[PDB]
A paper describes a structure:
To further investigate the importance of the flexible lid-like loop region, with a length of 19 amino acid residues, we tested truncated loops. Based on the sequence comparison as well as the structures of SptF in complex with 1, loop-truncated variants of 6 residues (His61-Val66), 9 residues (Lys58-Val66), 16 residues (Asn54-Lys69), and 19 residues (Trp53-Lys71) were constructed. Interestingly, although the activities of the truncated variants were dramatically decreased as compared to the wild-type, all the loop-truncated variants still consumed 60–94% and 17–77% of 1 and 2 over 24 h, respectively, and generated many minor products, including the E-ring-opened product 32, but not 3–5. On the other hand, these variants also showed 26–56% activities toward 3 and generated small amounts of 4 and 5, as well as other minor compounds. As a result, all the variants still maintained 24–40% and 56–84% activities toward 10 and 13, but dramatically decreased activities toward 21, 24, and 28 (<20%). The kinetics analysis of the loop-truncation variant Δ9 revealed that the variants also maintained comparable activity toward 15 to that of wild-type.
Here, we report the biochemical and structural characterizations of the unusually promiscuous and catalytically versatile Fe/αKG oxygenase SptF, involved in the biosynthesis of fungal meroterpenoid emervaridones. Through the oxidative decarboxylation of αKG, a reactive Fe(IV)-oxo intermediate is generated to activate a selective aliphatic C–H bond, which is normally difficult to cleave due to high bond-dissociation energy, and then oxidative products are generated following radical recombination.
Author numbering:
A (entry chain C), B (entry chain C): 4 to 53, 60 to 282
Write the structure that this text describes.
């Protein structure tokens, strides 16, 4: 296994194969510079007012996050293939700013899926329990604490010791590149030994039958109405389909998004006039 | 293993032991006749307007369900012990009326947990994935299709064939008795060979890290404010605690019920005056 950096236009099949073999990869130019700047602009004061800062609530705080980032075609292409065959639908798990102040120490090496009790029942050949997209806002370098990964460690059995620090491979990214982190990949933020902060931000998704880290039930109705149907489902506003007519997150026997009136209906002609 | 019928005042420890050994049991007088009648009164028109009827949405349709039944001390005593050590919090999964018209045929024998993909990873010695309380509204008899169980079948390995029909043990209940059905117990409704309908209703609960069959996000704010804090958590209005400060269903980094203003605050003295 190896850390691969692939162009945006790499076929989805090839990315899935790299994930299976190596457990992680970087997609270059995952976001353009416009999206990097709009996200920075929308979150920068929230981060400063928040040596590690990880504020979440990103769909509430960032219109670009809820209207654009969560529709990202690479996220959905990967998630449909990782979760679809086994579970059906998937939805958003959590997502935060990943901000390292100058002087921050190395983060403990971990698997993101450790907080699922069912990770103890899972085998390394089973689908992952969650998947994270870690997108660079600043450059990620060795010296500023860019995330480090241990390619192949997603295949280790449960209870395997963490990789040694010397086994960790730093991920070198320009603003807008993204690191893909299945829940089984061992990884960690590095130490920021520079005088400038290192910042990225994440999305993550997991099967529809697992409860997200973050609810979005507190978001204003008006924000929910500006989301696409897909993002409404990602953020907990729609009923979820398993397989063969099995649904969870139902309003009684019907769909939540019908019961809440979230789905658009046509006005009566008289009301329009 | 045997089907046991126990009095309401049976110690919780003894009920948990019976569940472990036999996989099911009946608690007599689980509800009093007042609660049976109030639930019937609140749902009867909804059932008739709905040879098997299983309408859900019970917290919306029944004040007694959301204000009284979901606070039932036996449900919480069992669920805390079944789910607490492994997962921390639990919450409501689904609950419907269980109505058999005269002439209905025997229901396929099943385990309730089959729709969880992770039931394939679980072992019979692991905690159940869900637990159901099936409460009699009418009497449950052999002839009217009272639920049947196969004591001990919760310990069978995954992929074991269903019990034979001749192995099924009918559950004979008076109005207000309750049958306890862990997700691993094989069971089914029987045929209603009488001229009168047979009706019960259910609650069910499962670990906080799994997505409920039913959302309650469509319920009016005013109904949510009349629930106890416990029932608010049961029905998806509160952040959920795993272990060692891990939470899911958070509003950002804080609690959902704070972000929505669901938790009562004291008015300003001037506003009160
Ligand atoms: O910030 C980083 O580079 C990596 N962070 C994490 O893996 C995390 O917080 O789970
Ligand atoms: O209605 C009954 O007696 C039993 N019903 C079920 O087990 C069910 O619908 O899952
Ligand atoms: Fe991580
Ligand atoms: Fe059942």
């Amino acid at each position: 296994p190896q850390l691969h950096y692939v162009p945006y236009d790499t076929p989805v099949e090839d990315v899935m194969r790299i994930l299976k073999e190596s457990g992680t990869l970087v997609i270059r130019n995952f976001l353009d510079q416009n999206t990097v700047q709009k996200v920075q602009d929308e979150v920068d004061d929230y981060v400063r007012n928040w040596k590690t800062k990880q504020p979440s609530n990103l769909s509430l705080m960032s219109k670009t996050y809820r209207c654009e980032v969560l529709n990202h075609p690479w996220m959905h292409a990967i998630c449909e293939r990782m979760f679809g065959p086994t579970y059906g639908d998937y939805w958003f798990n959590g997502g935060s700013i990943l901000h390292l102040e100058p002087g921050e120490n190395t983060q403990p090496i971990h698997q993101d899926h450790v907080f699922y009790q069912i990770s103890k029942w899972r085998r390394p050949t089973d689908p992952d329990l969650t998947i994270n997209f870690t997108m660079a806002l600043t450059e990620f370098t060795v010296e500023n604490g860019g995330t480090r990964v241990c390619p192949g460690s997603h295949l280790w059995e449960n209870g395997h010791a963490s990789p040694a620090e010397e086994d960790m491979v730093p991920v070198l990214m320009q603003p807008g590149d993204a690191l893909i982190l299945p829940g089984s990949m061992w990884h960690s933020a590095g130490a920021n030994r520079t005088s400038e902060y290192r910042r990225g931000f994440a999305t993550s998704f997991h099967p529809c039958h697992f409860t997200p880290i973050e609810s979005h039930h507190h978001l204003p109705r008006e924000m929910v109405e500006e989301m696409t149907p897909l993002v409404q489902k990602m953020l907990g506003f729609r009923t979820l389909n398993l397989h063969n007519n099995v649904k969870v997150w139902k309003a009684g026997e019907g769909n939540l998004e019908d019961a809440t009136g979230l789905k658009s209906v046509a006005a009566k002609l008289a009301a329009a006039l």
